[PDB]
């Protein structure tokens, strides 16, 4: 699925993403838009080898398990693949365990170099909550 910005907004509110760790629901909205242009099917194969998946683009080495990751962990305890799914349960759930592994958000690079410092309400205005 290719969300909508509102679309998203919502969803990411419902699973409990609003100030999870303090991080407003804009940054996760301009998170997802600079990943995965919002396409929960959105793939983007790494030179180690690694894959990122869905629409936050988690990566294989560390949090899911795509089979073909040499050396890697999986510490979402799930398939690459549930991370693809027009549901973004499985992302939400395991964005929320990689925001607490100490860098916060700064663990996605679209975040840091194109959310960071900005007025990320932009992202979440004309969208009922
Ligand atoms: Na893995
Ligand atoms: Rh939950
Ligand atoms: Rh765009
Ligand atoms: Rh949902
Ligand atoms: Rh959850
Ligand atoms: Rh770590
Ligand atoms: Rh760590
Ligand atoms: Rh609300």
Not at 84 to 108: P, R
Request: hydrophobic letters at 35%.
């Amino acid at each position: 699925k290719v969300f909508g910005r509102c679309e998203l907004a919502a969803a990411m509110k419902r699973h409990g993403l609003d100030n999870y760790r303090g991080y407003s629901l804009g940054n996760w909205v301009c998170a997802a838009k600079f990943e995965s242009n919002f396409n929960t099917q959105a793939t983007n194969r790494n030179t180690d080898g690694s894959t990122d998946y869905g629409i936050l683009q988690i990566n294989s080495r560390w949090w899911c398990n795509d089979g073909r990751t040499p050396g890697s962990r999986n510490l979402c305890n799930i398939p690459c693949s549930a991370l693809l799914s027009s549901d973004i349960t499985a992302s939400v759930n395991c964005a929320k365990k990689i925001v607490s592994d100490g860098n916060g958000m700064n663990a996605w690079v679209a975040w840091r170099n194109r959310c960071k410092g900005t007025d990320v309400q932009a992202w979440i205005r004309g969208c009922r909550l």
